[PDB]
Symmetry: D3
Subunit: 273 residues, 6 copies
């Protein structure tokens, strides 16, 4: 008897990092997962995104719990693709209970053109809209929508991609609260998780290193690692994907049936600074 | 098969009934030994009954039924010295203290009540929280979790002096918890505040609360108030249940929430979205 | 000679109303125009959108000035389509200087489902994003991006989910436009948002809008609504005319505003002065 | 040319500080667009303002620059701090031109410098806010439905939300809030009021020893080439300033029936300045 | 009395609007505490302000009441709207007393009424904000280290800020009183280096001819077409948190005396509410 | 007849510093005074607090004016003790007119444990609550409650103790205005005085010197004096206790009968630096 027993969960960006961690955690707690991921790079985003193989490994990891996995290569900027693959996924499972709008990029770097802003926004905000809007027809009383924000985003309230990332995340937050209001009469909840630094390929990337160590020409991971902890008030350079998955599991579960419009910081006190 | 608070020691003030009892039992089910403090007598300005001695005994027995230990004591959180004394005794018995649930509270509503109602709501609902937290501090070590009970209706601000005192105390419980979270973060001790909307307990289900929800009748019954309760929430419900708050408490008390601190944890069925 | 001599201007929602008025004014001032419009209805929006005929007539009115018009039936919710048609128009006109993201719906009604919120948002915000993001590759030094907000939307910061979606979309058009102005400023490209009050077009003169303005009546006529329209303005008028917005569009599109960027350009007859 | 119909055709416009800089620029642009201009300027220095103000010849030449467009000009040396003089000279100008349509309350000083006494606060405030009040309150009895009042604020002023610099910013902050109060009061009569907030403008005010010293506090006493290196920091667009003509284009829009329903607008011409604040 | 040492002993105080009301009260209080007084008042009506202002006699009687304390009084009929006249008479007054220590910029009108034209906005603003400016600025070159500038605000004025009838004059009054407040703090910051103080006093309802006026009764009883004083007196107390319809001029003079006195030598930029708790309702 | 003629005033922290200055000023103006002070040190507060002798001498100073003094050793953290001694004092003096909740500590130091936060808070906020709540049953129309804030506190909105101090002082402010609202119908007033730096033992202390000169390891007074003036807009390193007592006297006197809910800065313009 798991904490999300027999629920069906959509996870965007589910191939690796937080998304894969959420898929596995929820499956461990008794849910079947629909995993969507781009599975190829975006040009202005100067670290590798997930591969086809990552998404496969992610399905396998889920299946290993005894739950079922639907996998699809889908770009969240493509609504029709999201709609299409979601109908397929529902066909297999018959239901959709939880939406985890987790996919995102962080195309940082001051030398990048304004396209990087557009790309950060298209994926990080518009892709979230596309995800929820595609998912709404399928949701009934008791459904839970979970969106991924960013503490660094809220603080901003790095170049064109950084700016677009921050502003997209501020809108993920305010949009989530609008959605919460709109869906509350139907007992469908919507909440935003705001992580601080998370130990994933997004954080452990060359553009992110240069962001934390602007004093250095070519900072290494070891150099950035010295600057990582300043973001948190607790003594840690980052939280783990598991820390985010714990909050996702709480919000996915009927345990949180009356939690909606919550700005759920998993930040090690970053916002207390 | 480990519990979510496996072998932790938790203090719960106001543990005799309502949310506090629900928190005790929930955390005991999840593998924690529980220290329950409750005043077990009424407060004059507060015009509905508080917990009785039989309540506290029954709370302790319900915890013991899970196979965990319960330490129960009649303690008024307005009494710093008595809080520290009993807690010393309980920590000595249980070995350690991992979690603090500063839940005890009163809601002394009524337009007719004197200023004492302000001072009483403030003394219990804020000063009592401070006294609970400060008495606990010397025992807490890295990974400890402090959980305070706020109130959405609080944050949103005929209620009288007791209602003004209630609202202001709850506002300060919120700013205080966040201030404490900043000071405790370098030691990896967390502090977070839960803000319930309406909760189905003796505090909500009380004559002064019914007068507050129905300012248009002079002696409204529960049936009259129950018609007005839903206005508070955005989701179609008159209140949430004690189990809903316990679920938030369990999450914050568990190592699942090791990097969650300074959070204003609304369990409010959308109440704050109407503001 | 003209105030936008030889410029090329994309106008979305160009078939009628403010959009067509912008096209014609800008053509009269020396610019060639690309006019996009959906030319069909949207189910949650309970008034008719422009027709194929409206769009052809708008193109003709542009050409009447002696300048060139490129028309295309295009849903701003479809970015592929916006990009495809803009490509065709640019290969014909050789250039793109000014973007007027004017297309919008106002799907009011207290009886409408949450779909109405998504449709308002998809068109009014995502449609603006799609428009601008499609235009971005083509812009050079001195380019001008003009978006259309709404005073009533700002103020929002019964109308039903559609009204909520509308208001929120317009708030985001505003904050998005300023963020984009910041990012484009290094290349001397500007972005400004125009916030009209009531404008005398089919959006304002529509059955859902009459009900919005007369919630005291079950079945208000235009005449009943026209009595309420002036309350929105501080000046004694029921609305501004499309020509008033077009005058502001022409300033922003002209080289005369080369250093005007990040401006929230109210043409509201004092509507915001009522806070 | 002869018989052109302009954007401000046949209007009568009052422009304070119309002797040089933005004021002269507005006077000319509005003349080119068909308006007859009443120009007011103090035409002497102010002791706390440590750069020279306009001269009598400057004003005359502003009148001449106007007539060169084909339009009529009325000039008077008037200190906006003297409401009686404002009233007396305006009443002369209206009886002779027969009407008043537009008010450009542009007169201003910027008496910067850390060493100056508090009088520099009083002088900045008396000219830049009281003189604006003096201008408007004097002109009001003449205005009817369709008139347009246009006050000059300042982005640097808004952002700030020595003693002369403190008085300048605060005065500009009040120009802004006062213009919006006035717009609300005059809306029922269909009279409009709006404020233009320039960033750096290439004028004698920006090109002054006090300003250079303010932009470059690092040099003990700097020059124009020095300042011109630190002017750009103020704008988001890659420029050290806007020109007087950029402001005159906004003025022309607000003076014109084109902007008949535009009121209470905080009209930034700032090259993106405010997007850094 | 004369032979002993008062709280403003041997100071010289300018009070504008000194002919009656709070101004006359301030003058007499300060003189009992050892100060000589310069009393300025307009001593004639303003047309948009639909209640009588002070009379020439009022001003004479105020000087005499100052003199009855044993101190010296200097009176002049001055419109605070005319800076040239403020500066001219202030020079004459200072030349006669030799010094200026305290400025109390108290002169004001409240030209309320729905029916009045926009001139009532301009008149409220010219008297209540521009008059205060002309008062302070005319005084500045006479002030040395230790001087104290005291401006009269208004709680009702401030409350109106937070708030989104009173007519053009009412709007000009509230906006003017909001500017008195922000202006006094700006001035306080600019004068602090010279050890010159500036503070603003914000009264709630005060029992004077301004409060006891036909336009004020319409303001307090908008439900009545022609409310009397008795009608208005039922609504007056709603402004205060303490149970009273108004404070007295003496209450305001007590705060003026504190601020004028060397007792408050390090008090500056203070927003000094004397409001019986009015601001606790907003 | 003095400005507080025949009133009975309770002053907490009355042994020395501002509290003793308030006592003697009010006594000179005709009031009998009740003086409470802890009269021993608090471990996390690394400068000496008042002694038994300070308190007794403070009472003698009051008596010298011809008025009566009642002194008691009382830790304002102990409400039971505050109530008991106050019942004793009121029994003797017959009534209670004015409460001046002045007792405080400032336990600064970056090295100190979180206990210093709790101690600063227990004394400087809960201590004030205890004082006011213990006095409420004695108060009638015209009574005046005067709490002591801190400009440095308001600006903050140093170590755990510093943070505890600033936060406590911020709540003294908001609490005092709540109390004013609640007591207004009884015509009982409550006002908060916010001082800037005051020339007392709290300011003239090694932890305060380290606070104003974080760039040094053992700052002397001379080192700290170079930095004290930056806090004020007027050219002074601090105000004196007498400046604060002057404000206390105004608020204690019937002269301020209608002043309530006031945040009374005596800050030499500190807050004008925002
Ligand atoms: N890592 C951090 O420090 C941090 C902090 C705050 C928030 N976040 C957010 O958490 C979320 C998860 O990121 P992560 O930390 O797991 O990094 P990650 O890069 O490992 O995971 C992001 C995943 O989303 C996928 N993705 C990217 N663009 C997509 C698109 N258009 N369509 C479909 N899938 C796409 C990627 O392939 C990748 O698998 C993101 O929204 C990110 O912005 C991360
Ligand atoms: N019930 C609601 O609608 C609601 C909403 C928001 C917040 N809250 C808060 O939740 C908390 C729990 O209240 P509840 O709903 O369980 O009601 P409850 O009255 O059933 O529980 C409160 C308990 O605290 C005890 N208590 C009260 N004063 C005490 C004191 N001085 N010392 C020790 N124990 C004391 C009572 O005896 C009782 O057992 C309170 O802080 C309350 O303010 C309640
Ligand atoms: N009329 C008002 O009172 C008012 C007030 C404030 C703001 N606005 C805004 O002004 C803008 C113009 O509207 P209007 O007043 O001219 O009304 P309108 O309905 O006459 O014009 C809207 C035009 O946009 C077109 N359109 C709608 N959805 C589209 C889509 N998805 N793709 C392409 N075209 C689409 C319509 O067919 C129509 O031609 C809108 O953005 C509106 O929100 C209007
Ligand atoms: N130049 C800038 O960078 C800048 C930036 C923002 C705002 N402004 C504002 O723009 C306005 C125009 O100034 P400018 O840039 O043209 O500089 P300027 O010094 O060339 O023009 C100011 C003109 O006003 C006149 N003047 C000054 N005091 C007067 C008085 N008391 N009475 C009558 N006339 C008086 C001067 O003689 C001068 O001709 C001013 O209000 C100024 O504060 C200027
Ligand atoms: N009465 C209240 O309820 C109240 C409340 C808040 C603030 N105030 C303020 O207190 C101040 C004094 O008013 P009061 O209550 O004593 O009323 P009041 O009308 O009795 O006194 C105002 C005095 O100022 C004089 N005066 C008016 N305009 C003048 C001018 N232009 N030049 C010189 N003198 C002028 C009047 O003749 C009169 O003597 C005013 O600033 C007022 O706005 C009054
Ligand atoms: N000195 C400053 O710079 C300054 C600035 C702002 C505010 N304040 C406030 O002024 C007030 C008085 O301080 P001061 O400057 O006279 O310093 P001080 O240390 O000389 O005096 C404080 C007095 O309170 C007493 N006291 C401390 N804890 C007590 C307790 N628990 N119970 C009873 N008495 C206790 C002390 O023994 C001492 O006599 C304090 O609230 C302080 O925080 C001081």
């Amino acid at each position: 008897m798991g904490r999300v027993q027999d629920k069906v969960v959509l996870v965007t960006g589910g191939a690796r990092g937080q998304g894969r961690s959420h898929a596995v955690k929820l499956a461990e707690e008794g849910a079947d997962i629909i995993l969507f991921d781009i599975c190829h790079d975006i040009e202005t985003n100067e670290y590798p995104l997930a591969t086809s193989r990552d998404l496969e490994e992610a399905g396998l990891e889920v299946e290993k719990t005894g739950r079922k996995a639907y996998t699809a290569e889908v770009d969240v900027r493509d609504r029709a693709a999201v709609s299409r693959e979601l109908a397929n996924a529902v066909a297999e499972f018959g239901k959709l209970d939880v939406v985890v709008a987790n996919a995102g990029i962080c195309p940082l770097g001051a030398h990048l053109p304004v396209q990087a802003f557009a790309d950060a926004f298209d994926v990080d905000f518009v892709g979230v809209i596309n995800t929820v809007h595609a998912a709404l027809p399928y949701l009934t009383s008791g459904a839970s929508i979970i969106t991924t924000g960013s503490v660094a985003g809220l603080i901003a309230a790095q170049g064109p991609g950084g700016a677009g990332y921050s502003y997209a995340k501020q809108l993920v937050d305010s949009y989530t609260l609008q959605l919460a209001a709109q869906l509350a009469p139907q007992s469908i909840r919507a909440n935003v998780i705001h992580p601080t630094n998370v130990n994933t390929d997004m954080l452990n990337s060359a553009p992110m290193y240069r962001q934390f160590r602007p004093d250095l020409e070519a900072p290494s991971r070891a150099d950035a690692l010295l600057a990582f902890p300043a973001m948190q008030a607790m003594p840690t350079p980052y939280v783990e994907a598991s820390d985010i998955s714990n909050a996702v599991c709480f919000l996915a579960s009927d345990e949180s049936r009356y939690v909606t419009g919550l700005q759920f910081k998993v930040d090690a006190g970053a916002m207390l600074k």
